[PDB]
Design a protein around this ligand. Structure first.
Ligand SMILES: [Ca+2]
Ligand SMILES: [Cl-]
Length: 762
């Protein structure tokens, strides 16, 4: 039992950490609960939360040196700079006191690491610096880690239209699925060749990428099921968000108890509160809903004054801010400037062509600190209060599923939603006033559902705006995720008239790939005719065909056909289809293109290429995939299974700049894993070596109303301290598709407690 002084804490508080590393906080005041959460989040994740803050405020170079200056400048270009009075009120009514209590608890732990250097996280010693003190405003001013779009897609679409000319619409059709499948129209007044992709992406990456430590510088699914369809008779609510994997993990599980507060679940460890989980009356989980929140604005600048741009027939001056960037090893801070138009920060300027480009990012406006709208539903007790809280949900765009212990279930999407009167938001626009956001939509303009006749709701990042609903015409967004996971889960959930918690856990682990099944179906139609017939004479081609013939499209870790297919579908087939459908230079820009759109061509190639050419492309690329699989196997006769290639290594940010012995302790190797980006058990990978990069780390399946029966997992662990056994103890549970209890009642928490922490006001 540890006992710590707690300056700023109002009343004594206790923390019971259970055997799986989940902290259970018991405070005597509402706001004391958030003090303890900040203290406990620092205890487990101080380096991580300090790193997020350092990156967000543009303070990296202060300790990491001159290579980080450009990233610090761009980070400050995308901090919230609006009115703070409005900002605090955007999230609910007491967000400022919550944030103030939280950072006081963080700062208490920081002070403790100065008093007791054995408590300082290893990474600080590894890099030669110390944790910083926090201010409440830091919590809401940092924005750039929020999931968002579509600045990058606008640049890519414009670049393709500039390069592909008359083939642009066909090439863009293969590059990116739109839903609904509208025809993009170049905005009047846009020259798509006046969009320098490399410079813009570089500036955008410097402004938004997570903290990175390169060698050079150092040399989702959710668903809710009504009780009439569950084995318990109570609702079941499940959620597994799909995000970057790493050690430590993106999210952290915790439990807050105080007078007026009883919430348990997950969130990013630097944010106060809980955004996925339940409060003993309602439960909630989320998946991305893609309202378009970024537009690239293109300006003409005055030749006599490059800091002025044309706006409504007048030269309008940019606002220029000066920032001081402290650099390790330099006595004076660097003085840098950042220019802003009336629409946002200038990412790039070209005085040769008298042009500038600014990011018009809705996430720089009030209320867009990611997930912090949960302030207003952590204490909601019914649907009216949950729907009300979602009225002010800012970022990221999300589908919320809802259930309560009275048996109700529901769905409401939310997020700051831009009105574009005269463009679709799919291309950059002239910034001279012809294209202006008309305001934001009220959330009651979006569809929603409450106790639907079906008795179940599934969302999985697909466009779920009903085509006959008025919102289908409002330009909410046209760029959604591949819909395979949604279709697969919708099939499974509708096909089970009675299902249990065990069944929902299994669905989160489902590895059937609808792209695989559809590709297999196309293969059965390949004609033994034209050049394809000769290719079927290749022993290597016939070897691959044999593997696929006896496969059901289940992307299992122990499956050799699955390995062949994932190699083929990611690195061979689609690039070959695109190259056979487009001129060479548009094909190079499109690459593997959009899986859904390429699948459509494979199934109906008529207007793209002769069916015989389709067949030839499939078998030629399949041969190359088989060659690669053999190349990657122990021998060409003992072939690698998918799991042999698809390694689940949770990588630490410093892995590439430390030695082998140190890397082995920072990284967490969980072995081989099944699945792909397109299976409900999402295990997206990088194409170089098929290693895991993204998917569900935190997973949750709740018995809504019998709370102690809830199940969760996280990975690789609850602790961010490599010397703590909770750093890596959850990864095997996750690797087996298993869970541990989400204990909630006082008796269950006591039964599960392994350590007690006592905080005393001082
Ligand atoms: Ca846009
Ligand atoms: Cl557009």
């Amino acid at each position: 039992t540890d006992r710590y002084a707690a300056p700023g804490l109002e009343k004594p508080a206790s923390i019971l950490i259970d055997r799986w590393g989940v902290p259970h906080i018991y405070a005597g005041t509402l706001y004391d609960a958030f003090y303890a959460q900040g203290f406990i989040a620092a205890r487990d994740r101080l380096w991580q939360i300090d790193l997020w803050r350092k990156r967000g405020l543009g303070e990296m170079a202060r300790d990491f040196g001159p290579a980080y200056v450009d990233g610090d400048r761009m980070a400050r270009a995308v901090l919230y700079r609006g009115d703070m009075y409005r900002e605090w009120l955007a999230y609910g009514s007491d967000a400022k006191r919550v944030a103030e209590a939280f950072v006081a608890g963080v700062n208490a732990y920081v002070a403790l690491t100065e008093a007791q250097p054995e408590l300082l996280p290893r990474e600080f010693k590894q890099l030669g610096y110390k944790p910083s003190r926090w201010r409440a405003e830091d919590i809401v001013r940092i924005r750039h880690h929020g999931e968002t779009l579509n600045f990058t897609g606008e640049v890519d679409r414009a670049t393709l239209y500039c390069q592909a000319k008359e083939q642009a619409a066909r090439a863009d059709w293969l590059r990116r699925e739109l839903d609904p499948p509208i025809t993009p129209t170049l905005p009047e007044g846009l020259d798509p060749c006046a969009v320098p992709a490399a410079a813009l992406k570089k500036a955008y990456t410097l402004a938004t990428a997570a903290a990175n430590f390169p060698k050079e510088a150092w040399q989702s699914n959710n668903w809710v099921i009504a009780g009439s369809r569950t084995s318990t008779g109570r609702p079941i609510l499940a959620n597994d968000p799909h995000r970057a994997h790493g050690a430590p993990s993106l999210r952290y599980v915790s439990h807050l108890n105080a007078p007026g507060l009883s919430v348990i679940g997950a969130g990013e460890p630097f944010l106060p509160g809980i955004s996925i989980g339940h409060n003993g009356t309602i439960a909630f989980g989320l998946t991305r809903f893609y309202m378009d929140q970024e537009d690239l604005y293109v300006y003409e600048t005055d030749p006599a004054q490059p800091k002025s741009y044309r706006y409504r027939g007048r030269w309008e001056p940019m606002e220029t801010i000066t920032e001081k960037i402290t650099v390790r090893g330099e006595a004076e801070p660097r003085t840098v400037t950042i220019d802003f138009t009336r629409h946002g920060p200038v990412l790039h300027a070209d005085d040769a062509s008298h042009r500038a480009w600014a990011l018009r990012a809705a996430w720089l406006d009030t209320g867009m600190a990611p997930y912090f709208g949960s302030m207003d539903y952590m204490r909601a007790t019914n649907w009216d209060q949950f729907r009300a809280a979602m009225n002010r949900w800012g970022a990221p765009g999300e589908n919320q599923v809802y259930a309560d212990r009275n048996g109700n279930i529901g769905w409401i999407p939310g997020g700051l939603t831009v009105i574009r009167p005269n463009w679709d938001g799919l291309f950059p626009v002239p910034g001279d006033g012809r294209y202006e956001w008309a305001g934001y939509r009220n959330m009651d303009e979006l569809p929603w559902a409450y106790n639907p006749s079906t008795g179940h709701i599934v969302t999985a990042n697909e466009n779920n705006i009903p085509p006959d609903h008025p919102a289908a015409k409002l330009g909410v967004g046209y760029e959604w995720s591949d819909s395979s996971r949604a279709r697969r889960l919708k099939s499974l959930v509708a096909a089970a008239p009675v299902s249990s918690l065990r069944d929902s856990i299994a669905w989160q682990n489902d590895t059937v790939s609808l792209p695989a099944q559809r590709t297999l179906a196309v293969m059965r139609t390949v004609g033994n005719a034209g050049a394809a017939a000769s290719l079927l004479q290749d022993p290597q081609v016939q070897r691959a065909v044999a593997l696929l013939r006896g496969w059901d499209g289940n992307v299992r870790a122990d499956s050799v056909p699955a390995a062949l297919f994932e190699i083929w579908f990611s690195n061979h087939l689609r690039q070959a289809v695109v190259r056979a459908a487009l001129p060479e230079d548009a094909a190079k820009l499109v690459g593997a293109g959009d899986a859904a759109r390429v699948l459509a061509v494979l199934e109906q190639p008529d207007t793209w290429m002769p069916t015989a050419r389709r067949d030839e492309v499939m078998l030629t690329s399949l041969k190359a995939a088989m060659a690669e699989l053999e190349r990657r196997s122990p021998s060409p006769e003992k072939l690698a299974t998918w799991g042999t290639l698809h390694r689940a290594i949770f990588r630490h940010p410093l892995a590439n700049i430390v030695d082998d012995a140190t890397r082995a302790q920072y990284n967490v190797d969980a072995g081989g894993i099944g699945g792909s980006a397109f299976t409900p058990m999402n295990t997206s990978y990088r194409n170089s070596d098929y290693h895991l990069t993204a998917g569900a780390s935190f997973r949750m399946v709740l018995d809504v109303g019998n709370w102690d029966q809830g199940r969760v997992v996280n990975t690789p662990g609850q602790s961010g301290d490599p010397g703590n056994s909770h750093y890596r103890d959850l990864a095997p549970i996750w690797a087996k598709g298993q869970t541990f209890p989400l204990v909630y009642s006082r008796k269950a928490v006591e039964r599960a407690a392994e350590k007690r922490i006592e905080l005393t006001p001082r």
